[PDB]
């Protein structure tokens, strides 16, 4: 398809869980996603590390019960009022990310099933980020 | 800590699973990680999308049984002989990613628990990618 697009999704919460040292990563990741399953929460973005993982939820109705449950498998921190921006396009993804050079970015994900690049920013940086991505994607 | 580092991990396999339309994402993600738990496989990088997810394993001993099991919850494709590169450092991550402008990249992940940027490339592009990242990170 011959499509270029920029999309923003507001009202996002990011959750960071640093796994307990006691837990083997493969058990930790299953337990983690099982907690999100229980509360029927879709996750738009995920990024793992050696230490732990950050992921998003699109509503906070169940947030306290989710943090409570997660606090059993790791140390949990939360940042509210975030925004997911999705950019739909030979290094393309590098050029797009490079347009965000001047804006703080909390997460980046590329390689799921598409050529879409996903980025998470604070609400206060949404406009700056969208303007830079629109100018680059559509020039 | 006042540390800059570049690290490469060889012998990686990437698995792409496009979820069955029948399945709600939150159930799909738990089932998925539960299959990796059964086979005790750690996952260094993950990237989700609307359609489905891509993830890595560091050995292929259990690969056929994993694809077999996953084929029940989605359409599965696999690419072997990959390499994970980790770069440890106000837009820093954008500048680092921008050094890969000329190299094909299969995945990018940033935001797990660190300021580390993770990238997945084919074995044939390891040297080019490492040279570009070392020059940028260490100049």
UniProtKB/TrEMBL annotation, chains A, B:
Q: One Gene Ontology cellular component annotation?
A: cytosol
One GO term under biological process is: threonine biosynthetic process
Keywords on this record?
Amino-acid biosynthesis, ATP-binding, Kinase, Nucleotide-binding, Transferase
Source organism superkingdom: Bacteria
Q: Where is the Aspartokinase ACT domain?
A: 85-136
Entry keyword Transmembrane:
no
Could you state a single Gene Ontology molecular function term? Answer: aspartate kinase activity
- Describe the family membership recorded for this protein in Swiss-Prot or TrEMBL: Belongs to the aspartokinase family.
Listed name of the protein: Aspartokinase
Note the residue range shown relative to the complete protein: 296 to 440 of 446
């Amino acid at each position: 398809d011959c499509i270029k697009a920029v999309a923003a999704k507001d009202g996002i919460t990011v959750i960071k869980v640093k796994s307990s040292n006691k837990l083997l990563s493969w058990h930790f990741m299953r337990k983690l996603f099982e907690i999100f399953e229980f509360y029927q929460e879709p996750v738009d973005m995920v990024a793992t590390s050696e230490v732990g993982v950050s992921l998003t939820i699109d509503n906070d109705k169940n947030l306290p019960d989710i943090v409570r449950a997660l606090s059993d498998i790791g140390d949990v921190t939360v940042d509210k009022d975030m925004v997911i921006i999705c950019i739909v396009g030979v290094g393309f993804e590098a050029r797009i990310i490079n347009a965000l050079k001047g804006v703080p970015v909390r997460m980046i994900s590329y390689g799921g099933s598409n050529y879409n690049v996903s980025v998470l920013v604070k609400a206060e940086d949404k406009k700056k980020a969208l303007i830079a991505l629109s100018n680059k994607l559509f020039n």
